[PDB]
Scaffold this active site. Structure first.
Site, PDB file in Angstrom:
ATOM      1  N   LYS A 243       0.902  -1.341   0.223  1.00 49.66           N
ATOM      2  CA  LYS A 243       0.332  -0.361   0.180  1.00 49.66           C
ATOM      3  C   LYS A 243       1.100   1.646   0.282  1.00 49.66           C
ATOM      4  O   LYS A 243       2.343   1.775   1.130  1.00 49.66           O
ATOM      5  CB  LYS A 243      -0.910  -0.013   1.484  1.00 49.66           C
ATOM      6  CG  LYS A 243      -1.656   1.254   1.272  1.00 49.66           C
ATOM      7  CD  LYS A 243      -3.447  -0.127   1.881  1.00 49.66           C
ATOM      8  CE  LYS A 243      -4.574   0.529   1.717  1.00 49.66           C
ATOM      9  NZ  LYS A 243      -6.064   0.301   2.955  1.00 49.66           N
ATOM     10  N   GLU A 365     -28.866 -14.031  -3.348  1.00 49.65           N
ATOM     11  CA  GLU A 365     -29.098 -12.625  -4.746  1.00 49.65           C
ATOM     12  C   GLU A 365     -28.685 -11.802  -5.446  1.00 49.65           C
ATOM     13  O   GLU A 365     -28.854 -10.771  -6.143  1.00 49.65           O
ATOM     14  CB  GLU A 365     -30.546 -12.326  -3.448  1.00 49.65           C
ATOM     15  CG  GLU A 365     -31.501 -13.093  -3.030  1.00 49.65           C
ATOM     16  CD  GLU A 365     -31.790 -14.267  -2.467  1.00 49.65           C
ATOM     17  OE1 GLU A 365     -30.329 -14.617  -1.554  1.00 49.65           O
ATOM     18  OE2 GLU A 365     -31.824 -15.582  -2.305  1.00 49.65           O
ATOM     19  N   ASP A 423     -45.931 -20.320   5.066  1.00 49.69           N
ATOM     20  CA  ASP A 423     -44.666 -20.075   5.677  1.00 49.69           C
ATOM     21  C   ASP A 423     -44.558 -18.981   7.084  1.00 49.69           C
ATOM     22  O   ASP A 423     -42.878 -19.335   7.436  1.00 49.69           O
ATOM     23  CB  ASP A 423     -44.240 -20.156   4.131  1.00 49.69           C
ATOM     24  CG  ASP A 423     -43.317 -21.188   3.333  1.00 49.69           C
ATOM     25  OD1 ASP A 423     -43.457 -22.280   4.040  1.00 49.69           O
ATOM     26  OD2 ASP A 423     -42.771 -20.978   2.060  1.00 49.69           O
TER      27      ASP A 423
END
Ligand SMILES: Cc1ncc(Cc2c([C@H](O)CO)sc(CCOP(=O)(O)OP(=O)(O)O)c2C)c(N)n1
Ligand SMILES: Cc1ncc(Cc2c([C@H](O)CO)sc(CCOP(=O)(O)OP(=O)(O)O)c2C)c(N)n1
Ligand SMILES: [Ca+2]
Ligand SMILES: [Ca+2]
Ligand code: NA
Ligand code: NA
EC number: 2.2.1.1
Lengths: 620, 620
Positions: A243, A365, A423
């Protein structure tokens, strides 16, 4: 094409380029007074080799469909992205100093107002998913020669979404995709967990199905060679870097993330780096093979009107699958994505009819949304992704960034509300209206029957921005004629009389509960007007107020959603202050529970009897 | 503490138990007419061996703090969880047949209204993170002998959040945690990507630092043995199973996920499974070592009043870190979690003062929220997690499930709105009020100065549910005296008079812009009332209406947030229909861009000049 093995002078020019990129990254962030020069500097050789040896692209036409794609997943290194595009001749060199200014488009993190940016990044861990969508498109849809390169940080690799993308790429054999991991040891506020344990990064990449190559990330030669070999797998170039590489006193030190160099220091450091540059002569970009196909841009129309029949019963989740499959016969641009829920969302119908254009994304998702975003870049496809609406909450940051990316994707979430029944709440979408309404480029469709669903699918396909379609599990009656005209921002009065006492606004299951309440009330000689918004965003404020004015100014909104951010708050915000207008709101007041659909609509106060009681209450 | 190596009669009893669990899972789901018996049946030997050989717990006191913990991450296997608690004697066997009924608490997926459930599951991929919080708590805070067991599906392993948890467990050396992977080959709608490639699951688990053991998941003996060895690492039991194991003709078949057996079929299959059971005698649970400490439940109070002085300037993000560190000196239950942003959120102040109670979660927000939920179970700790508010969108499904889990966690999101300036929209929270207001158990604090911030931290610590504290980057003046009293649901009028013409509601930076607008308007001889909500949820509607009635009914809301779901919509929804009241809204209308903080407030219409112009317009 053969690898061009660079000579020492080309290697030295790449080194010179990397050092110019360092200098520009420092100059821009010092001028701005903010930014991330140490994050830029660990990537300087990587950037120089990709843009001036490995990749193929039109320097004056960054969005050209034939070009290799580059995705800067570690978006905070934006100054070095700007610098390479100045080095390639697209961006004026002086403009680099206007980084982060309101008078510039060289913003803090990359955004698509920049021609050289396809997807906005800055929320870490999302770029690899977009890159996977681009690579899938290149290999399977465009069937073109372009490659896709994605640069990640090592801290960034702590995000689960990255591993979803890693797995996706190996499942789908994305041998045109390269991930470059900038293993510079440090995150923002401490070292990254694995530091410089290069072997463990290699083992993780290999376990996920990638070809993994450890390199010295500050060796232009090793980078040229590693990028120069194609593989039969997605390839991870695991680059050991420091870095702040090249900034004396700062290289490999903590307490420097996101900290610019003060003017005096920048001047000293830049003189030190410039002393290392052997020639001012810049390398030229090399153009691509032009084998990406043409794509049609025209509006997409359903091949025929809906063929339902008034009175027949169909759940809008099934009507969505039917409609999407139908639209796919009209255009090859339509693609469908789903997260192991295709039998429940009915996207399986599209997979059966158009398998080459269905993408199984599995239970992931976040990645699914990013794949869709990548597939929609450069308008190559028109994606429809689906799952239960509840699980789009898993991908809210990807949806949020999709709007920042000015993406045109379509999302259909099923199983909304308590009306799914047994559910229970983990599967019930009760916050999706709030979520999607807060997305600034969104259009929110809430179709109440199968006809409206088919119309919503067609409209969404031709609407820019983040389109959401909310579908439902109960099998409600078709109420609209097949030839009813539907438009974004236009509601429907589905029941009216001259002596209506209240305007009842409902959607999906609550529209049908409102119609049922109207029949109950008729016995009592009480008529109610019933209004179907069609789109929740934008809302048809005019029809809502014209209706209310015909019903003693009274509005009752009823929704299978929480109180906040949904239909009732949208209606209240639209009409507040209008003389004589009142609004009563029925919604779900707390986390639900299991039971039959009708039982839960009753428990949560949004069924036909709750509506009728609300109306009788209001007339007093 | 020595492993008890089972004899064949114990092994046969464990098999009999597994087969009783299968029977019950079928009976309950056939009775309900919905559910997931095939997902139960792959896990039956795992469940028998955990509950009746390996685990130590009080069968009549499932929440006992000394008990081993079990997390059913694949929550749709709830019926077999209910069966084991009936087998253990806690639940009545007859109640199992009431699965999914509105008259029962044996809901579709597990929820904490069940004494044997700590966290609600049902959104896949979250249980392991909760388990990691429990295990971290047990090893480092309670410093107790209980172990934590988490059962996952193989499709579920596609969720990135699982891998975040896997990496957390190895970083933090959770050698009291066991993940059991039910590798039954099939997902919901297709085979899981890796199917029965057991070696690849082993490689992935090992690369992430776990001790990985592949077993036959239908062998009670192999399971006894694998669970019976403790390790110095988190351990993954990679169990090769068949979906629908024991259901002749259904075992290892597609098209059976979430499909109950019809009555006639259930009867035939149950007779066959029953024929395999050798004895009706049940195994007894074994109690645990009682070495978990006492924890104090009392109200938590700051050791002194805030020590800010009116006029001093401090950003509320820094006041948050100061306040959190101060409260940690007041109570030993306070823990802090952050996702590599501690230097930006100022949670580093707490780490410095109370390092043993700070948990670095790295760049992995979804896991961070799940860790906090796990740490809060059984009230063992009071967690405060922080990052930039924008990146809580990455964890919305974990926050959603936290409310379904009736969890008491505290969330502080910094860097809200455009007022952060130059970083740009990827870092700007503009939808966080929409998001958190839609979480049904939430309390939303938006402190406008340092004093309000410290009071918000104190109140949040003693408030149940999902508490959110929205902090800000600009340094704004302290406007409250240190002794000002604050309460949830109580706003403050910070500027008023007899001749006020508008009630302007602002928060954080926009409260200060409203005060500046009022000084501006004074030049014009125009007085405005300024109101600070303190909590956005619940809103002080009484004070807002009383204020509006004193200001000609006029309200103007101004917020550094999008229009939907924020302050303006909350206010409109609260007062809609009140005679004479009008509400005008100023918010951010689209995805922003980089610039100085003041330039962005101006561009997006929410600075002092925009407020003043809006006020003038209402007066005319
Ligand atoms: C999901 C998510 N969580 C937190 C952040 C804040 C953040 C950053 C801002 O873009 C600029 O400081 S950079 C950063 C550290 C990134 O570290 P690495 O990935 O190792 O990259 P680097 O060392 O190459 O800079 C964080 C935590 C983020 N951007 N996204
Ligand atoms: C984040 C998230 N995405 C999708 C779903 C829907 C779903 C389920 C419902 O709880 C019950 O059908 S179960 C399920 C399949 C789970 O497959 P596995 O993890 O292999 O478990 P199993 O084979 O042991 O049943 C999905 C896709 C989910 N629950 N959570
Ligand atoms: Ca790094
Ligand atoms: Ca499975
Ligand atoms: Na669209
Ligand atoms: Na709290």
């Amino acid at each position: 094409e053969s690898y061009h093995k660079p000579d020492q002078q080309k290697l030295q020019a790449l080194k010179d380029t990397a050092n110019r990129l360092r200098i520009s990254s420092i100059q821009a962030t010092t001028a701005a007074g903010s930014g991330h020069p140490t994050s830029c500097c660990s990537a300087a050789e990587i950037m120089a080799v990709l843009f001036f040896h490995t990749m193929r692209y039109k320097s004056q036409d960054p969005r050209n469909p034939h070009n290799d794609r580059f995705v800067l997943s570690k978006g905070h290194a934006a100054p070095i992205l700007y610098a390479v595009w100045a080095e390639a001749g697209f961006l004026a060199e002086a403009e680099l100093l206007n980084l982060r200014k309101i008078s510039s488009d060289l913003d803090g993190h990359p955004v698509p107002k920049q021609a050289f940016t396809d997807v906005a990044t800055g929320s870490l861990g999302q770029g690899l998913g977009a890159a996977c969508g681009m690579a899938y498109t290149g290999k399977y849809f465009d069937k073109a020669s372009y490659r896709v390169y994605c640069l990640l940080g090592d801290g960034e690799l702590s995000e689960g979404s990255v591993w979803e993308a890693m797995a996706f790429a190996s499942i789908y054999k994305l041998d045109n995709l390269v991930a470059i991991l900038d293993i510079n040891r440090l995150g923002q506020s401490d070292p990254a967990p694995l530091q410089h344990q290069m072997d463990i990064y290699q083992k993780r990449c290999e376990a996920f199905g990638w070809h993994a190559i450890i390199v010295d990330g500050h060796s232009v030669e090793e980078l040229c060679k590693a990028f120069g070999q194609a593989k039969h797998q997605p390839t991870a170039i695991i680059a050991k870097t420091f870095k702040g590489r090249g900034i004396t006193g700062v290289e490999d030190k903590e307490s420097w993330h996101g900290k610019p160099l003060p003017k005096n220091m920048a001047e000293q450091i830049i003189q030190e780096i410039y002393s290392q540059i052997q020639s001012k002569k810049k390398i030229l970009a090399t153009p691509p093979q032009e084998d990406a196909p043409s794509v049609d841009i025209a509006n997409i129309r359903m091949p025929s009107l809906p063929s339902y029949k008034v009175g027949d019963k169909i759940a809008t989740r099934k009507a969505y699958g039917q409609a999407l499959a139908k639209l796919g016969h009209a255009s090859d641009r339509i693609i469908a994505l789903d997260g192991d829920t295709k039998n429940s969302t009915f996207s399986e119908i599209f997979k059966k009819e158009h398998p080459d254009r269905f993408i199984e994304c599995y239970i992931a998702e976040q990645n699914m949304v990013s794949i869709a975003v990548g597939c929609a870049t450069r308008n190559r496809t028109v994606p429809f992704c689906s799952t239960f609406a509840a699980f789009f909450t898993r991908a809210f940051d990807q949806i949020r960034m999709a709007a920042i990316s000015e993406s045109n994707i379509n999302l259909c979430g099923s199983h909304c509300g308590v009306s799914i029944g047994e559910d229970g709440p983990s599967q019930m979408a009760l916050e999706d209206l709030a979520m999607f309404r807060s997305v600034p480029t969104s259009t929110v469709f809430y179709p109440s029957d199968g006809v409206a669903t088919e119309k919503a699918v067609e409209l969404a396909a031709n609407t820019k921005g983040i389109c959401f379609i909310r579908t439902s599990r109960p099998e409600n009656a078709i109420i609209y004629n097949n030839n009813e005209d539907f438009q974004v921002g236009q509601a429907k009065v589905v029941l009216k009389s001259k002596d209506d006492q209240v305007t009842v606004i409902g959607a999906g299951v609550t529209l049908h509960e409102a119609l049922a309440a109207a029949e109950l009330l008729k016995k009592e000689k009480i008529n109610i007007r019933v209004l179907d918004p069609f789109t929740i965003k934008p809302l048809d404020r005019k029809l809502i107020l014209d209706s209310a004015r015909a019903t003693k100014g009274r509005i009752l909104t009823v929704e299978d959603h929480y109180y906040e951010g949904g239909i009732g708050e949208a209606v209240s915000s639209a009409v507040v202050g209008e003389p004589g207008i009142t609004v009563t709101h029925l919604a779900v007041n707390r986390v639900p529970r299991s039971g039959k659909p009708a039982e839960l609509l009753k428990m949560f106060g949004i069924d036909r009897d709750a509506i009728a009681q609300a109306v009788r209450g209001l007339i007093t």
